[PDB]
Amino acid sequence: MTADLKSLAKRIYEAYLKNFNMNKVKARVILSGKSNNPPFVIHDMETLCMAEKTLVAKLVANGIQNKEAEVRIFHCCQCTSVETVTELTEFAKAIPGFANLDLNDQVTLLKYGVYEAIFAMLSSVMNKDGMLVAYGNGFITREFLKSLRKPFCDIMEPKFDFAMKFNALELDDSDISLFVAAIICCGDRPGLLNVGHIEKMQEGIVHVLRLHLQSNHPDDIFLFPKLLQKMADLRQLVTEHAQLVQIIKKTESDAALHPLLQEIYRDMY
Numbered sequence: 649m650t651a652d653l654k655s656l657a658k659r660i661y662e663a664y665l666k667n668f669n670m671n672k673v674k675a676r677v678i679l680s681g682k683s684n685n686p687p688f689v690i691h692d693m694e695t696l697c698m699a700e701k702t703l704v705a706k707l708v709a710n711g712i713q714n715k716e717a718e719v720r721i722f723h724c725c726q727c728t729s730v731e732t733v734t735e736l737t738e739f740a741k742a743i744p745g746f747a748n749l750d751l752n753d754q755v756t757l758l759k760y761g762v763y764e765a766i767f768a769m770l771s772s773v774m775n776k777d778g779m780l781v782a783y784g785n786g787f788i789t790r791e792f793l794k795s796l797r798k799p800f801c802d803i804m805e806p807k808f809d810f811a812m813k814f815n816a817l818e819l820d821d822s823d824i825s826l827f828v829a830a831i832i833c834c835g836d837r838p839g840l841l842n843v844g845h846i847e848k849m850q851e852g853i854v855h856v857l858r859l860h861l862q863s864n865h866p867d868d869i870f871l872f873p874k875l876l877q878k879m880a881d882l883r884q885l886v887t888e889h890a891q892l893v894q895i896i897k898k899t900e901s902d903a904a905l906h907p908l909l910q911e912i913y914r915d916m917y
């Protein structure tokens with residue numbers, strides 16, 4: 649790894665640590681039970697409702713006008729995505745050539761990349777039993793999410809399935825930061841104006857990723873192609889997620905979609 653490419657990997661990593669509220673080290677410290685403001689455990693309806701009253705009090709301050717639990721949970725899912733979209737938009741500036749792209753191309757890349765990146769990074773807050781939520785202040789169990797009424801019980805399980813395998817690769821955030829940058833730099837997204845420049849930007853970050861994995865994971869000679877496959881798997885996970893969100897939109901009148909997320913989904917797949 650030349651000084652320039654090692655430096656670029658470090659730049660990316662530092663931008664990740666700055667711009668994401670959650671990183672894998674921070675998540676592991678919490679998940680280990682290692683303590684001021686430890687996470688509320690949400691494993692059933694009683695504990696969901698207690699957690700809501702402390703952590704999202706406005707959402708349950710409406711008396712009997714409060715929405716159904718599953719709809720409140722989905723609203724909190726969406727708020728989490730909106731916040732992660734903001735973080736990803738600032739992170740993207742650290743990627744060589746991204747800020748030099750036409751504004752419309754930056755929008756297109758973020759539109760198609762954000763959910764892939766969201767689900768990749770969600771792995772860092774997931775273990776086989778549950779996941780961190782609410783800025784690290786809740787732990788919601790995988791079984792509780794599976795217990796929700798249909799269709800809401802179908803949202804998170806495929807993301808756990810992705811995450812258990814992704815986490816078995818034992819990436820750290822120096823790896824994950826470059827993987828997220830590579831997700832954002834896909835030249836095959838629909839509607840790009842300057843494909844060739846995006847392809848060169850992609851090639852550059854993927855080269856940095858390949859060299860970084862070779863150095864940081866000398867034990868796994870397949871790690872780079874494994875991650876290329878994970879990117880394809882994410883694209884599929886997102887297509888399926890968008891299909892479920894469309895079902896919710898059509899059949900669940902109380903589950904209002906945030907306008908930023910509606911725009912991301914519009915004409916996506």
Ligand SMILES: CCCCCCCCCCCCCCSCC(=O)O
Pocket residue numbers: 699700703704721722724725726728729730770781782786788803893909
């Ligand atoms: C009191 C706390 C309740 C916590 C539930 C929070 C679960 C948020 C994590 C991500 C959800 C997945 C986002 C995809 S689902 C919404 C979307 O499509 O953006």
